Symmetry: D2
Subunit: 343 residues, 4 copies
C-alpha cells in the first residue's frame, strides 16, 4: 500500500525551497560547467583553463551588483565551485545566500551510450548519490540538477531511450527528496536536425508524459520538484520559419497537456539560442493567453553569461563591464518571466 516516502515536515521543507527558487520574477543562473565544459568557453577568449580563472569568472558572476537579487532565485554550481571562496574569503554558497539566492549543485556524472540504439544515451551518476546529497545538503545546497539528453531523429527518441531516461530521472529525484534537496527534472530534447515545430511538440509531449508517469511510479512529491524542459522549437536545420508566438503556443500547449498543476515551476533552458532570442521567447511564453498553473521562468547558463564572458575577455580590468553585461541580461530575463520584457 502506501508507505510514505516523506513525512509532512520533509514535504514542508521541499515545497518551501521550491517556491523560494521560482518566486515571481526570479530564475536560475546555471553556473554549472565542468572543467572540460568551461574549456571551450575560455578558449573562445584565449584565457587558459585554470582553477584561478574559473574561480575568478564565477566570482564575477556571483558577486555582481545588488540589482540581480530580485532576479536570481537560485544558482547551480559545479562540485569544485561549491567549495571555492570569493576574494573576501566568503564561501560561494554564503555569497549566494546573502544575495537571497538558493544554492544548487549538478549531481549527474554525464551521458553514456545505450547499446542497440542510434546514438541514444542515458545519464549516469546514481551510485552513492544519497551520501553525496547529504554532504551537499550540509554544505549549503538546497536543490540539485540532473541532465538527460534526448535527440530527435528518424527512429529517435526510441521507446528504450525514453523509458530509461525517465526511470533514471525518477530515481535521482527520489534520492534527492529523501535527502531534503529539491530535484530539478531536466529532460532536454536537443534542437538538432531539420525537424519542424510540430514534431518537436509531439516528441516533447511524449517525453514529458513518460517523465511524469515515472515520477508517479517512484512516489515523487511533485510540489517539491521543478521542471527544466526545452522550449518547443524547430530543429536548427529546419527551413520553415516560426514566429515567437508560435513557439510560445507550441511550448505552453505541450506543457498543459503533460505537466500536472502540482509541479511548482518550469525553468526553461536556453539550449543554444542567443541571449536576446531566449529573452524574447521566454517573454512570449509568459504572455501566451492559455492558462498556466505553474511558474514559467528561466534557467540559463549561456543566455545569461555570453556577453559577460566576452566583455571580460579574461583580463581582470574588465570586471565591472562584464558584470554589467550579466546584470543587464539578468534584468531582461527577470522581466521576461513576468511577461514584461519589451526590447
Amino acid at each position: 500500500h502506501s508507505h510514505p516516502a516523506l513525512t509532512p515536515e520533509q514535504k514542508k521543507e521541499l515545497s518551501d525551497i521550491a517556491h523560494r527558487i521560482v518566486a515571481p520574477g526570479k530564475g536560475i543562473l546555471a553556473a554549472d560547467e565542468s572543467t572540460g565544459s568551461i574549456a571551450k568557453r575560455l578558449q573562445s577568449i584565449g584565457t587558459e583553463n585554470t582553477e584561478e580563472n574559473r574561480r575568478f569568472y564565477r566570482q564575477l558572476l556571483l558577486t555582481a551588483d545588488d540589482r540581480v537579487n530580485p532576479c536570481i532565485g537560485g544558482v547551480i554550481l559545479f562540485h569544485e565551485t561549491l567549495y571555492q571562496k570569493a576574494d573576501d574569503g566568503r564561501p560561494f554558497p554564503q555569497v549566494i545566500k546573502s544575495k537571497g539566492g538558493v544554492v544548487g549543485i549538478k549531481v549527474d556524472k554525464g551521458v553514456v551510450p545505450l547499446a542497440g540504439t542510434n546514438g541514444e544515451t542515458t545519464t549516469q551518476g546514481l551510485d552513492g548519490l544519497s551520501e553525496r546529497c547529504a554532504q551537499y545538503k550540509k554544505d549549503g545546497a538546497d536543490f540539485a540538477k540532473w541532465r538527460c539528453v534526448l535527440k530527435i531523429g528518424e527512429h529517435t527518441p526510441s521507446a528504450l531511450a525514453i523509458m530509461e531516461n525517465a526511470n533514471v530521472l525518477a530515481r535521482y529525484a527520489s534520492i534527492c527528496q529523501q535527502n531534503g534537496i529539491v530535484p530539478i527534472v531536466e529532460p532536454e530534447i536537443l534542437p538538432d536536425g531539420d525537424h519542424d515545430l510540430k514534431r518537436c511538440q509531439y516528441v516533447t509531449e511524449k517525453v514529458l508524459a513518460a517523465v511524469y508517469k515515472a515520477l508517479s511510479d517512484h512516489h515523487i512529491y511533485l510540489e517539491g520538484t521543478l521542471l527544466k524542459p526545452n522550449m518547443v522549437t524547430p530543429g536548427h536545420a529546419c527551413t520553415q520559419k516560426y514566429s515567437h508566438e508560435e513557439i510560445a503556443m507550441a511550448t505552453v500547449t505541450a506543457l498543459r497537456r503533460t505537466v500536472p498543476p502540482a509541479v511548482t515551476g518550469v525553468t526553461f533552458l536556453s539550449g543554444g539560442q542567443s541571449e536576446e532570442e531566449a529573452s524574447i521567447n521566454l517573454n512570449a511564453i509568459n504572455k501566451c493567453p492559455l492558462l498556466k498553473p505553474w511558474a514559467l521562468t528561466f534557467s540559463y547558463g549561456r543566455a545569461l553569461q555570453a556577453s559577460a564572458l566576452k566583455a571580460w575577455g579574461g583580463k581582470k580590468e574588465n570586471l565591472k563591464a562584464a558584470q554589467e553585461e550579466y546584470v543587464k541580461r539578468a534584468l531582461a530575463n527577470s522581466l521576461a518571466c513576468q511577461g514584461k520584457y519589451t526590447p
Copy 2:
C-alpha cells in the same frame, strides 16, 4: 512519428463541445440507467418497471422548469431513452437541446471479471463502438460516457486492474474522438471498505496517473475530453471522521498531482452519498484555496434525482412537486460548482 489522429477542425469541434458542457455554473444530469438499474429505484416506490414509467420519469426530469437551463450543461441518456419522445412528440434529444443542453449517451456494456484477481473487473463494449458512435452522433449525442470500476481492498486495485481499465478507457476515448464525440473518462473508485482518506487519495493518484499515461499513449486529445472521478473520501466502513474541507483538500490535491491542465473539466460523481452531502462537498472543493486550472462541477445521477423520485412516488399527480424537488437540487449544485452554495 506523428500521424495525426485528428485534424484541426475535428479538434475545434471536440473542444467546443467540451467547453459547452462544463461552462461556468453548469453540470451534467446523469439520466443513464438501464432497465435493470432503474428497477431498484422504481421498486423503492412500488411502481413497476415499464417502458411507459421509465419514459414518463425521464420526461419529468428533462421537461422541468426553465430555471434549470443555466444549471444543466449536459444530460447522459441510456440507449432507449435517446429514441423516446416526450408528450408533445419532440424527441428527448431535441428537448434537451432546446433547453441549451448537450446530449450524451452511455456506450459501455458493463463490467466483466478479470480472472486471477480478487473480485476485480474490467469494462466491455468496445466491439462495433465506432459504428455505434457514428449513429449516436447523427442521432444528436455530442458526448459519451464509459464507466470503469475499481475497488480498494488489501491487494486491490492490482496492477492488472489499473492497466487494463486504463487501456480500455483510452481505447474508448480514441474511438469516440474519431467520431466527433467528447468522451467522458470515468475511473470510479468504489467507496466500499474501511479504508481511510489517505489510502483513497493514494489509490486515486495512482489510478489517474495510469489513466493519463494511457491517454497519452493512445494519442487522445485532452482538450476534447472530460474527467469524471470519485471524490476522495474514506470508505463507508471507516470509523475515522473527516470534515468537508479535508475531503475537499484531499480531492483537489489528488487532481493537481495527476490531471494535466489541458483537460477541460472535472465532473464529479456522487457515488452513494446523499444529495446535501454531495452539494456540500462540491462546494468545498470549489472553495479550496489551491489553484484549479480545470472546471470542477457535478455529474450526478442520484444526488439530483432522489428527492424528485420520492416526491413523484410513481403517481402522475405529483409531476410538478417532483419537478420542483429536482429544480431545487439542480440550483443547489449549480451554486456549489461555483463555490457559492450555502445551505
Copy 3:
C-alpha cells in the same frame, strides 16, 4: 497476491486439449473463413458464394479419406459451419471428432483502425466473449482462434500497436481459459514491404516478447495455450534471396529467444506462400539443429486447401479428385512437421 485463475482440474483439462491438438505428426486445418473471406476464393472458380456451396466445400474438406486422421489434430471452424451438418446428417463437430480431431472456432470480430498510427490496427470481439465461449464449448469446440495483425513499415509496428494487440490477445486468452477452451495466440506479422529477413526477425522477437509479457500479466496458463506466429521471412518485395535453411534458422532463433518452454506447441501460419513452399519451410524448421522444446507444426488454411479448391472447380463431379489433392497436402505437411518431408 495469488488468487488462482484456474483450479488444478481446469488446468488438467486445458493441457490435455492442447497436447491433443499438436501431438506428433499433427497440425491444424484452418477452415475458418467468413462469407466475405471465402467469396474471393469461390470467385477464383466462378462458383457463386452460397450457404450450400460453402457448406459443400467444407464437407469436402472435413469428410476426406481416413488417411488424414493422423495428420489433422484440429480444425478451425467459422461460426456458421459449426452448426452445419454433412450429407449423412452428422454435425460437422461430430464429423471432426469421429476422425480424431479437435474442433475449434474463430472468435474474433476483425480488425479496426488505431487512430494516430500509420495504418495500424487492433482486433475487436471481446464483448460478450465469455458467453460465446461457453456456448461454443457445449457445442463441441475445444479451442479458439484470434487473429492480431501487425505490419512492418518505416515507423511500424509502433509501441501502441504492439501494446494494444498484446493486451487484447491476453484478454481473449484469459476469457477462453476461464471457459475451458484452449486459446491459440496468433500475432501475425504481415509479409508486406521490402524489408529483409533480419528486420522481420527483429520485429518478430519484439512482438513475441510483448505477447508473453502480457500473457504473464493476465495470469494465462501457458501449458494450456498454443502459439500461431508467422515464419520469419523477408517481405514480398525484398530483392535479397534466402535459402530455406536461413528462413528456418531465423524462425527457430526468434522463437528460442522469446517463447518459454511451457508453451505446448507452435502452429505456423502459411501467410501467403505456396503449398510446396510452406511444406518445405516447415520441414526445414523441424530439421534445424537448435533445440526446440515445443512442438513445431502447421496451421494452414490456404496451403492445405488451394489445390483441392482448384481440383473441385465448384462442380460436384470432382469431389474425390479435390479430396485427394487435400489428402496429399495433409500428408506432406504431416511429414514436414516431423522433419521427414522430402519432395
Copy 4:
C-alpha cells in the same frame, strides 16, 4: 529500427564463454565476498579479518586438488582477490584458468533503499561500469555478477521494486556484453517469512517475466547470458513441509513458464540452505521429468565452502583437510547438476 548492439563476432565470443561456464557437470564457485561480508565467516572461527587471511583462504579454495577441474566451470572473485597472487606468485586469474575455469567478478556496489516502499531495495553500481568492465576484461575476467534482492511480504515485491530491479539488471547486462563479458543475471528472492511454496512460485514467475521483458527491451543477447535464480522453496518460517520433488517441480515449472530456451544456463544459488540440502535439491531439479532446454547447475558460495571453512579453522595446519572438504562438496554438486548425485 534495428541498430545491432553486437556484431556477429562479439556474439560468438559471448556465447563461447557462456557455454564454457555451464558445460555438462560444471558449476560456479562463488568466491565473491567483500571484507564486510567475509568478516562474519571469519568470526565464526575467531580468525581476524586480514588481507593475509582472506588471501590465504581463497588460495585454499582456488589451489585445491586436480579433481575439481571437471567440477568447476567458473569462479566469481571479489575485486581485490582478482589482483592477488598465490604462494607460487601466479595471479589468481591465472590459477583459475590453468585449472580450466573461467574467471568472474562481482561488479555491483550493493543495495540501496527504494523510498516509498516497505523495506524494498535496488542495486547500485552502474556508474563507470563500462570502464570497470573493460579493465576487468583485460585483467582476465570473462563473466560478471550482479545481485538484485527481492523479498516476499504482504505488499512486496511491489511493482516498483520489480520494475526497477529488472531495469538495472538489463542495464548492467547491456554494459557487460558491450565489453565482452558474460553477465549473470541474479534476481534473488529472499527465503524470509512464512510464505508457502505456491507463493514463492508465483512471485518467482512474476519476477522472471519482468526480467526477460527488460532484457528484451534493452537488446540483450540471451545466448550470451546466464541466469542465477533462487530455487522455489517455502519461506524459512513456513510450517508446511515439502519434499524435494515438490521443490524441484515448483522450480522447474517456474523456469519453464518464464525463461526462454535461448538462455544458455541456469546456475542456482543456495540461499541459506545447508550443503547437503543444496546438493539434494539440485539433484532433484535435474531429475525432474519436465523438459529442460537450458543447463541446470550450481553457483554456490556457502554450500561449497562451509565445511572447508570449519575444517580450516583459521590455522594453516589444516590446509589439506579443508581442501578435501571443499573437493568432496564440489564433486557432490558436480554429480547433482547431472542428476547423478545419490548420498
